């Protein structure tokens, strides 16, 4: 059907997103960028497990969807249907072109063939958060999802608390002092620059 991923692996052209100039782009293969028990709080699923790439290459949307399916299936099998949260942090915006030969190379400018995501070295690809007891299951799910991507990517567990930008060790102290207010999937940080009415709303 489509060309092998070897053709569109390297970042050779400038980013070519879908816009007014580039129309007729087929829809991306991946449509759901996060699944599982996404309707959960910060305090119940702190793991912050990440998959980080080491190559400046392009990851196809089909590969992203396949890896998401595999990781979700293994995670459901191991932990449970609502015992984790998987988030994909790559969206296919770059559009690749196809010059199909039934004229030669004259007037060679391809039509939109598909969507691809440009990934830098050290950029997070997929993230999974769950309870502390499921560390082995998280790393196994990420290792299984590695085989659905080209290049070389590492599996890392960060010091952050879940999908937040605050360290896990200092998270509880900040929550206790009400520096951090939970808000759905994430947490809300309140500085001291706000009007005193907002501070009076809390601490009471």
């Amino acid at each position: 059907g489509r060309r092998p991923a070897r053709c569109y692996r390297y970042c050779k052209n400038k980013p070519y997103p879908k816009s007014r100039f580039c129309r007729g782009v087929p829809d991306a293969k991946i449509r759901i960028f996060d699944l599982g028990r996404k309707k959960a709080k910060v305090d119940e699923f702190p793991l912050c497990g990440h998959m980080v790439s080491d190559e400046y290459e392009q990851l196809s949307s089909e590969a992203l969807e396949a890896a998401r399916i595999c990781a979700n299936k293994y995670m459901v099998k191991s932990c449970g249907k609502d015992g984790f949260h998987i988030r994909v942090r790559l969206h296919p915006f770059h559009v690749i072109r196809i010059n199909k030969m039934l004229t030669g190379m004259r007037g060679a400018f391809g039509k939109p063939q598909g969507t691809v995501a440009r990934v830098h070295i050290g950029q997070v690809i997929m993230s999974i958060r769950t309870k502390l007891q499921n560390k082995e299951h998280v790393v196994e799910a990420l290792r299984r999802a590695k085989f659905k991507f080209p290049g070389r990517q590492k599996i890392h567990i960060s010091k952050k608390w879940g999908f937040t930008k605050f360290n896990a060790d200092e998270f509880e102290d900040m929550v206790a002092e009400k520096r951090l207010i939970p808000d759905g999937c994430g947490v809300k940080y309140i500085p001291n620059r706000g009007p005193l009415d907002k501070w009076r709303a809390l601490h009471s």
Binding site: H50, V52, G122, Q123, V124, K154, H156
Partner: protein
């Protein structure tokens, strides 16, 4: 090939900076430009009449003619083989005084002062500028405290 448009490629060159649109300040309108004044040209998109060409933007020239609301400036322009001293007519709003010559004028006045002065004294003063000399060897006093060690930091993956 590209078009021969006069204002081609001037999307950002002839554009007012951020939060600086609107009425042109009147200080620029009431500045005088004598003959032989060094002036650097910067185009302004608010005024369309008297607009200098894009090749003279950022160039510096000398004023040789003056009109009611414009001046004539001779500006050197290189065309693929040589530098041509050509004269153009530019309106006042695209014209400002160059501050490169004022430092030289100030140094000339200071040198004239140092020439009139210290002449009856008999001691010749250094008038010529000199580059940065060696750093004039000195003493460093570490009173009490010893220098602090700076060991390299072990690597850890943060991403």
């Amino acid at each position: 090939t590209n078009t021969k448009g006069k204002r081609r490629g001037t999307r950002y060159m002839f554009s007012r900076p951020f939060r600086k649109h609107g009425v042109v300040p009147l200080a620029t309108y009431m500045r005088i430009y004598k003959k032989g004044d060094i002036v650097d040209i910067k185009g302004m998109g608010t005024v369309q009449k008297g607009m200098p060409h894009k090749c003279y933007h950022g160039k510096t020239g000398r004023v040789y003619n003056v009109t009611q609301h414009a001046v004539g400036i001779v500006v050197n322009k290189q065309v693929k083989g040589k530098i041509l001293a050509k004269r153009i007519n530019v309106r006042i709003e695209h014209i400002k005084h160059s501050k490169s010559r004022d430092s030289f004028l100030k140094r000339v006045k200071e040198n004239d002062q140092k020439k009139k002065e210290a002449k009856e004294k008999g001691t010749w003063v250094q008038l010529k500028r000199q580059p940065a000399p060696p750093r004039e060897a000195h003493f460093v006093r570490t009173n009490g405290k010893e220098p602090e060690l700076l060991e390299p930091i072990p690597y850890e993956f943060m991403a």
